[PDB]
Structures are given as C-alpha cells and as structure tokens.
C-alpha cells in the first residue's frame, strides 16, 4: 500500500455527491474513486463507469460489494421528503411533505448511515467523512417537523455514532446549500450553529464537495466536527489554506 487511497462516496448521484464523485475522479494523482448510488438511472447519470456500484444503504448485504477494499468513505446520502400531492393553495394552508415508507430519516439517516459506517468498519476503512446539516443543536428546529421525520435528530444520532466508533471521522454540518459556483467564495467553519446568527450561513454544494475532499488530505480534518458556511462570490477571497481551515476546529462533536 504505497498505493493511493480508494475513496468510496455514497449518494453519488445526489447533487452534492455527484460533485465529490467527479472531484475524486479528477484527483487521479491523489485518489482512486468509487461511488455508490441507488439506481441504474443514477449510475448512468454520473457516467456509468465500472467504479460505480448500485445499491440501497438500508439493505446491508446489498452494499457490501461497494465497501470492499475501501480506504476512505464520504457519506452523502440523505432521506428526502416529497410534497404530499394533496395541497390546495387558494384557501391557505401550507403543504405537507412525506417520506416514502421505509425511506424516512430514522431509516435512512440514522440506521441507514449506521449500515454504511458498520460496513466500512468491517472492510477496514481508515477515514469516514459525513455531510449533514446545521441546526442540530436545537431539537425544536422546524426541519424536524418536515414529514414528521425528525431529520436533524436522526442525522445527529449517526454523527455521534460515527464520532464514538473510533474510526477517524470528519462531520461537516452544512449551512443552506447553494447550486452556486464552487471555489469562488471564502468558506467559513463554525461550531454548534453559531453561524446561524450571521449572514454567512449558506454554502455552494461544490464547496461542500471540495471540503469533503480536502478533509481526506489533512490529519487535522480527522476526529473533527464543524459547521460549514461561506461568504458570497465577488465580496472576498476564495479559500486556499485548507490545513489552516481545519486547524481552526477543535471539536470532536
Ligand atoms: N438542501 C439543503 O439546503 C441542505 C442543507 C444542509 C445540509 N444538507 C444535507 O447535505 C447533504 C447533501 O445534500 P444534497 O441536496 O446535495 O443531497 P441530495 O442530492 O438531494 O441526495 C442524497 C441523494 O441521497 C441518496 N439516497 C437516499 N436514500 C438512499 C438509500 N436508501 N440508499 C442509497 N442512496 C440513498 C439519494 O438517491 P437518488 O439519487 O436515487 O434519489 C440521492 O443520491 C444531505 O445529507 C442533506 O440532507 C442539505
């Protein structure tokens, strides 16, 4: 093993996941990419290459092939609520969202993520990175009511399980995600939702993807949990010193 590390990214066809997948592919001088997606549809979307595997994270055996021989894992899966089809705006209410049965946050973000962490551990991974959301410090956060799923709570339960496991881990709680241009913004790291009290609380999906990558290259990023926000494009200078950035973080959770 003077070989480059094999990095598996799950949720590889998701919006943020497809960028990490693409970045790991471009970074051929640093990584060997691998990805896991939920559908053949998703596999073709990111390029149908042979390093992409199809499987459901809540079906334990089903994901084992993907995890074989991996050295690092980047978890980018998430439960996703869909608008329940009954809404009628013109006599004011507010849409209710739903999660397909067996696809709720408890099953996908907590148990599901537990599935992935447990398989990575069996396979001997060395570093696990997971992407989540800011807001977890407040159990009464409105997002937990979406689809009556408590999505932040189950995600944080999997973050604690990851931090507790002993495997080198980085937990990145992202602020509001943006389909905005990555690498063109000064990025900010916070602790325990403090950034929510600022105007720099959202972040380009491409910068969340690049932070996941860099976490893989610095000892500093290991055994760290931090929030991620940024400043708009055009106002300041885009982040470059990543060792410094991660050396700002001291929290293990
Ligand atoms: N949206 C925001 O503003 C925001 C803010 C802060 C944090 N975050 C979080 O940051 C992360 C990235 O966000 P994002 O919007 O870019 O994610 P997302 O794209 O929309 O999706 C993750 C996607 O996760 C996969 N997935 C769901 N259930 C699965 C299962 N049972 N097995 C395997 N894969 C499964 C989905 O598969 P399909 O492609 O088949 O659907 C999909 O690839 C998420 O954890 C999200 O909750 C989001």
Residue nearest to atom 12 of ligand 1 (CA): 16
Which of the listed residues 8, 12, 13, 14 should we mutate to test ligand 1's pocket, taking the one with most ligand atoms within 8 A of CB? 14
> Whole-angstrom distance between the N-terminal and C-terminal Cα of the chain?
31
Q: Are 225 and 171 in contact (CB under 8 A)?
A: yes
Write out the two tokens for 15: 């919006």
Q: Which residue has the tokens 């990555």?
A: 182
Pairing state between β 127-133 and 72-75? parallel
Q: How far is the CA of 206 from the centre of ligand 1 (A)?
A: 14
Pairing state between β 169-174 and 176-178? unpaired
35 Cβ contact partners less than 8 Å away, ≥ 6 residues apart: 8, 9, 10, 12, 13, 17, 21, 24, 46, 51, 52, 53
The resolution in Å comes to 1.8
Which residue among the candidates 13, 78, 133, 230 is catalytic per the annotation?
A: 133
Which ligand 1 atom is at minimum distance from the Cα of 58? 31
Q: How far is the CA of 191 from the centre of ligand 1 (A)?
A: 23
Q: How far is the CA of 12 from the centre of ligand 1 (A)?
A: 9
Task: Report the distance separating Cα 14 and Cα 46, nearest Å.
Answer: 10
Neighbours of 146 (CB within 10 A): 18
Which ligand 1 atom is at minimum distance from the Cα of 107? 31
Task: Report the distance separating Cα 189 and Cα 217, nearest Å.
Answer: 17
List 228's β-bridge partners, or say none. 174, 189
Q: State the method.
A: X-ray
Which ligand 1 atom is at minimum distance from the Cα of 13? 43
133 is an active site residue? yes
Among residues 147, 174, 155, 163, which one has the least CA distance to residue 112?
155
Structural domains present in the chain: 1-253 (3.40.50.720)
Calculate the CA dihedral of residues 118, 154, 192, 141 and round it to 10 degrees: 170
Neighbours of 75 (CB within 10 A): 29
Among residues 14, 62, 10, 63, which one has the least CA distance to residue 34?
10
Q: Are 182 and 206 in contact (CB under 8 A)?
A: yes
Strand runs labelled E in 19-68: 32-37, 52-54
Q: What angle do CA 141, 117, 72 make, to 5 degrees?
A: 110
SS3 state of residue 110: helix
List 189's β-bridge partners, or say none. 228
Task: Name residues contacting ligand 1 (CB within 6 A).
Answer: 11, 13-17, 38-39, 42, 56-58, 76-78, 80, 108, 112, 131-133, 174, 176-177, 205
Which ligand 1 atom is at minimum distance from the Cα of 173? 7
116 Cβ contact partners less than 8 Å away, ≥ 6 residues apart: 10, 57, 63, 67, 73, 75, 77
Q: How far is the CA of 212 from the centre of ligand 1 (A)?
A: 15
Pairing state between β 127-133 and 169-174? parallel
Q: How far is the CA of 116 from the centre of ligand 1 (A)?
A: 15
Helix (H) or strand (E) holding 246, with range, is helix 242-246
176 Cβ contact partners less than 8 Å away, ≥ 6 residues apart: 201, 202, 203
SS3 state of residue 27: coil
Among residues 43, 44, 39, 52, which one has the least CA distance to residue 7?
52
What are the backbone angles phi and psi of residue 181, rounded to the nearest 5°?
-60, 120
Q: Are 78 and 109 in contact (CB under 8 A)?
A: yes
Residue nearest to atom 43 of ligand 1 (CA): 14
Measured in whole angstroms, the distance separating CA 124 from the mean position of its chain's CA atoms is: 20
């Amino acid at each position: 093993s003077a070989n480059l590390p094999t990095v598996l990214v799950t949720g590889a066809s998701g919006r943020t996941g497809q960028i990490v997948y693409k970045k790991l592919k471009e970074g051929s001088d640093k990584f060997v990419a691998k990805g896991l997606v939920r559908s053949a549809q998703g596999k073709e979307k990111i390029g149908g290459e042979a390093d992409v595997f199809i499987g459901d994270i809540t079906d334990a055996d089903s994901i084992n092939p993907a995890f074989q021989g991996i050295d690092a894992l980047v978890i980018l899966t998430s439960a996703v609520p869909k608008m329940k089809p009954g809404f009628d705006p013109t006599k004011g209410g507010r849409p209710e969202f739903i999660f397909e049965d067996g696809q709720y946050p408890e099953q996908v973000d907590w148990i599901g993520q537990k599935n992935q962490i447990d398989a990575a551990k069996v396979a001997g991974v060395k570093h696990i990175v997971v992407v989540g959301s800011m807001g977890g410090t407040n159990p009464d956060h409105p997002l937990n009511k979406l689809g009556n799923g408590n999505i932040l709570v189950w995600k944080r339960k999997a973050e604690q399980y990851l931090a507790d496991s002993g495997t080198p881990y980085t937990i990145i709680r992202a602020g509001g995600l943006l389909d905005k241009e990555g690498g063109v913004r000064e990025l900010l790291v916070g602790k325990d939702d403090e950034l929510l009290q600022t105007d720099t609380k959202t972040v380009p999906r491409a910068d969340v993807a690049e932070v996941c990558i860099q976490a893989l290259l610095f000892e500093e990023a290991k055994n760290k949990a931090f929030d991620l926000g940024s400043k708009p494009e055009g106002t300041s200078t885009p982040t470059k010193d990543f060792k410094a950035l991660f050396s700002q973080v001291t929290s293990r959770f």
